[PDB]
UniProtKB/Swiss-Prot annotation, chain A:
Pfam families: KOW, Ribosomal_L27e. InterPro entries: KOW (IPR005824), Ribosomal_eL27 (IPR001141), Ribosomal_eL27_CS (IPR018262), Ribosomal_eL27_KOW (IPR041991), Ribosomal_eL27_sf (IPR038655), Translation_prot_SH3-like_sf (IPR008991). Its main location: cytoplasm. Component of the large ribosomal subunit. Required for proper rRNA processing and maturation of 28S and 5.8S rRNAs. One of its GO terms (cellular component) is cytosolic large ribosomal subunit. It comes from Oryctolagus cuniculus (Rabbit). The modification N6-acetyllysine is found at residues 26, 92. This is Large ribosomal subunit protein eL27. One of its GO terms (biological process) is translation. It comes from the Eukaryota. It is found in: Cytoplasm, Cytosol; Cytoplasm; Rough endoplasmic reticulum. GO terms for molecular function: structural constituent of ribosome. Component of the large ribosomal subunit. Interacts with RRP1B. Interacts with DHX33. The keyword Transferase does not apply.
Swiss-Prot record, chain B:
Keywords: Acetylation, Cytoplasm, Endoplasmic reticulum, Isopeptide bond, Phosphoprotein, Ribonucleoprotein, Ribosomal protein, Ubl conjugation. It comes from the Eukaryota. There is a cross-link at residue 107 (Glycyl lysine isopeptide (Lys-Gly) (interchain with G-Cter in SUMO2)). InterPro entries: Ribosomal_eL34, Ribosomal_eL34_C_sf, Ribosomal_eL34_CS. Belongs to the eukaryotic ribosomal protein eL34 family. It is found in: Cytoplasm, Cytosol; Cytoplasm; Endoplasmic reticulum. GO terms for molecular function: structural constituent of ribosome. Component of the large ribosomal subunit. The ribosome is a large ribonucleoprotein complex responsible for the synthesis of proteins in the cell. It comes from Oryctolagus cuniculus. The modification N6-acetyllysine is found at residues 35, 42. GO terms for biological process: translation. Pfam families: Ribosomal_L34e. This is Large ribosomal subunit protein eL34. One of its GO terms (cellular component) is endoplasmic reticulum.
From Swiss-Prot, chain C:
It comes from Oryctolagus cuniculus (Rabbit). There is a cross-link at residues 3, 8 (Glycyl lysine isopeptide (Lys-Gly) (interchain with G-Cter in SUMO2)). The keyword Zinc does not apply. GO terms for biological process: protein-RNA complex assembly; translation. Component of the large ribosomal subunit. The ribosome is a large ribonucleoprotein complex responsible for the synthesis of proteins in the cell. This is Large ribosomal subunit protein eL38. The modification N6-acetyllysine is found at residues 8, 66.
Length: 135, 114, 69
RNA sequence: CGAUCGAAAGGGAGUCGGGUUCAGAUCCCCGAAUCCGGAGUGGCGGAGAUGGGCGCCGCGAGGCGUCCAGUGCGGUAACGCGACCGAUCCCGGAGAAGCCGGCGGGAGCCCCGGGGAGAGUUCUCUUUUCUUUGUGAAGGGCAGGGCGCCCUGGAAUGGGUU
């Protein structure tokens, strides 16, 4: 059975975002004419939220809980799939494949990834996705 | 044929007293004292025999002059470790951490029945 | 030495505060404009004899000109 | 982890071209650079960064008011772009490496065929013989050399290759 699904959490193995976690938002298992290899559009996080503990102020928690996201198309052999899955919405009208021609649309794709990731992080769910991989 | 002499008082062919020939606007051949050849950094993994890419090979005190983008690669462990041993350490750090969760689950699986 | 490709940046380098002098070299198939700044001697290379003469009037008036020969 | 000393051949950032004396020149003069250190007011420019939603107005071009975000960006990747916060602590690299053989590249010198310039022979011959015929450091671009770097793809009728 195929596992490269649009809910799967993967690890990035190469590039600038190496060692960072992403969620597949659109897999393409058989290559397009421009990208002959099997690939996937993912939407991950660049800057992990910092360690937030008690005996801290409320405006400081909102400062440590700041997620910076990224949107990128990756080859499959540059990805490390996990068993973990997250049910994040990520509506596909704003996060898609012709995002990589207009930088303003890439800003909106990163913004829409960022707001949903911060909203999911402030509920205490999918907590393995938001801790950095120690390597 | 114009035979040429040293321009400094060190008359011995040591490692620091290395020269090269140069043709001059006055139409004569001079010695130019060269600098030692630099080396790219070796990877921090310790297994790859090749040197790192994207970093200029200079003498160590030249690295004061150079900007940061000439001294590293935009990656985690960039300019200090090769990409092969970065991704082979990402996989290792993920998989051993997963296997520890498997061992933790199988511990409670034994303690549940016993 | 630095080579300025365009004409527009040459005017800023000539209008710098540290521009000590400007000098014009008239050789064959080339006109050379050299601004002596504090660090570099900036050279503008013009292969158009009409633009050389209009730029020669277009130098700023506060700069000292030395027409070389 | 032992004060301190210990190499004008080890390590050790950064200067070259022309000219000049009766005797000194990478030191004097001229012209080009370069290294290190310094800065409250930080001298200027650039980066950080000036984006979006909602509600009005403006025909629109766009303009006020709120709610937020914003410690950069691109490439599948090797990695790239002019910057691109971060301490105590930790890890690593450079400095920092023997002798010999073979091969390849690039210089300098030598060699051959011509153009100039000036000399030598010429009793006879010799389009002949001799001399000379260029560009520094630093920056930018392009050859060239090397890669135990990456992507596609899967190879026996085994191939590639010195
Ligand atoms: Mg010495
Ligand atoms: Mg040369
Ligand atoms: Mg670099
Ligand atoms: Mg001593
Ligand atoms: Mg010494
Ligand atoms: Zn390695």
């Amino acid at each position: 059975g195929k596992f490269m699904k649009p809910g799967k959490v993967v690890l990035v193995l190469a590039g600038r975002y190496s060692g960072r976690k992403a969620v597949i938002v659109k897999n393409i298992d058989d290559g397009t004419s421009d990208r002959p290899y099997s690939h996937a559009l993912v939407a991950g996080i660049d800057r992990y939220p910092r360690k937030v503990t008690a005996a801290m102020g409320k405006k400081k928690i909102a400062k440590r809980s700041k997620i910076k996201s990224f949107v990128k198309v990756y080859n499959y052999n540059h990805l490390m799939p996990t068993r973990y899955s997250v049910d994040i919405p990520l509506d596909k009208t704003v996060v898609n494949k012709d995002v990589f021609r207009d930088p303003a649309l890439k800003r909106k794709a990163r913004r829409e990834a960022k707001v949903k990731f911060e909203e999911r992080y402030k509920t205490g769910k999918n907590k393995w996705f938001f801790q950095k991989l120690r390597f | 044929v114009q035979r040429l002499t040293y321009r400094r008082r060190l008359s011995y062919n040591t490692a620091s007293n290395k020269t090269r020939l140069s043709r001059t606007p006055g139409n004569r051949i001079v010695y130019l004292y060269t600098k030692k050849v630099g080396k790219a950094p070796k990877s921090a993994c310790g297994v790859c025999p090749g040197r790192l890419r994207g970093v200029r090979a200079v003498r160590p005190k030249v690295l004061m002059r150079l900007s940061k983008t000439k001294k590293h690669v935009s990656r985690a462990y960039g300019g200090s470790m090769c990409a092969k041993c970065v991704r082979d350490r990402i996989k290792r750090a993920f998989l051993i951490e997963e296997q520890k969760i498997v061992v933790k689950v199988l511990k409670a699986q034994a303690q549940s029945q016993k | 030495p630095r080579k300025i490709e365009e004409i527009k940046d040459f005017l800023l380098t000539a209008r710098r505060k540290d521009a000590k002098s400007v000098k014009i070299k008239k050789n064959k198939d080339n006109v050379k404009f050299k601004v002596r700044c504090s660090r570099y001697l900036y050279t503008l290379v013009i292969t158009d004899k009409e633009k050389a003469e209009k730029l020669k009037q277009s130098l700023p008036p506060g700069l000292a000109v030395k027409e070389l020969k």
